[PDB]
């Protein structure tokens, strides 16, 4: 565009979109589990991925992934959720934090224990 056109109209800035709107600007959110189940991933992966339906303190109700091998979550469990989507699961945008509230740490975990919330043996 010409200089006069830039003076008349300018350049439009770029507005970013939040990928974790249910967090409402917080790093983490507490919630209560309503449904715990397994879901199947999209092509090409094949598995039974453990997820929870979580009703949060911020008013939203979302789906969160449960990482690690084995878990103790069930209906009415209190959990903490953090950002981060699971690529191969449709509509899953959040991760349950292991080792907080009613979500126990991963048993017999020996590597990368700060994730999965396992104490030093």
């Amino acid at each position: 565009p010409t200089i006069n056109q830039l003076v008349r109209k300018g350049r439009e800035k770029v507005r970013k979109k939040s990928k974790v709107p249910a967090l409402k600007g917080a790093p983490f959110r507490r919630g209560v589990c309503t449904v715990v189940r397994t879901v199947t991933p999209k092509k090409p992966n094949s598995a039974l991925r453990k997820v929870a339906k979580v009703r949060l303190t911020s008013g939203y109700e979302v789906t969160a992934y449960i990482p690690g091998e084995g878990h103790n979550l069930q209906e009415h469990s209190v959990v903490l959720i953090r950002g981060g989507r699971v690529k191969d699961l449709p509509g899953v945008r959040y991760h349950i934090v292991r080792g907080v509230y009613d979500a126990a740490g991963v048993k017999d975990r020996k590597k990368s224990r700060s994730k999965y919330g396992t104490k030093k043996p």
Partner: protein, 249 residues
């Protein structure tokens, strides 16, 4: 329970034509197995495919203990092999679903008049002194449910009463059938689920000539024998597990 007759429904899962061919293989295997155990088999429903498979096949196992011995075959069966519909020689993973139900009863439906209330009253509309003075209109009420049927079609109280009772019987029979069908549908869904590759109950690996039952971790290497109807080892292992699971306390 374990002593009645069995209804077996085999449906093709994921995999298309190969899935239908695998459903046909399962059908042959179960037919030969039932013959080897002494039962009598009749095919109730059949939907074949052009290549010789079945998209769906429903048959009956008649004999004391048919359901009890076929009750471990319910679920998703997974096959890993090179299809005959495959052109490039790749291995494919397909599934077939098996549903096992106990054959039910055909108890006839009748109206118990002790729970039925009949009211008679004047009809509405034309007729002069006749309709002004006659108790021709009939109402029948099924007291347990509160369902009522009213008949006014004829000038005669007797015919109206008979018609109302007939209509009430048909309505109650329809409701009974609907609830039975809903219960059976829920049972079927609980058995077969979605037919996805996961949630499988048994895997038949042809390249490795291996059969694996994942409920009990039982692997054997006689795939041809199993597919010819030799299911006794797997079934005895499953019965072992069922008897051991009740170790209380």
């Amino acid at each position: 329970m374990d002593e009645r007759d069995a209804i077996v429904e085999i449906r093709a899962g994921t995999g298309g034509e190969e899935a239908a061919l695998f459903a046909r293989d399962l059908f042959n295997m179960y037919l030969r197995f039932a013959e080897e155990m002494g039962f009598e088999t009749e095919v109730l429903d059949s939907h074949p495919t052009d290549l010789g498979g079945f998209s769906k096949v429903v048959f009956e196992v008649r004999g004391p203990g048919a359901y009890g011995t076929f009750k471990y075959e319910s679920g998703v069966h997974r096959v890993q092999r090179v299809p005959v519909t495959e052109t490039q020689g790749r291995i494919h993973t397909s599934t077939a679903t098996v549903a096992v139900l106990p054959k039910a009863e055909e108890e006839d439906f009748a109206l118990n008049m002790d729970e039925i209330r009949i009211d008679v009253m004047r009809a509405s509309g034309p007729g002069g002194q006749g309709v002004n003075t006659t108790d021709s209109a009939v109402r029948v009420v099924h007291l347990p449910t509160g369902i009522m049927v009213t008949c006014q079609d004829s000038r005669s109280q007797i015919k109206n009463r008979e018609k109302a009772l007939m209509i009430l019987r048909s309505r109650l029979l329809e409701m009974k059938r609907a609830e039975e069908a809903e219960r059976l549908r829920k049972t079927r869904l609980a058995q077969i689920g979605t037919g996805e590759r996961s949630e499988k109950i048994r895997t038949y690996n042809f390249p490795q000539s291996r059969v694996t039952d994942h409920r009990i971790g039982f692997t054997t290497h006689d795939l041809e024998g199993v597919l010819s109807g030799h299911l006794t080892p797997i079934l005895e292992a499953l019965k072992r597990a069922d008897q051991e699971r009740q170790l209380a306390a």
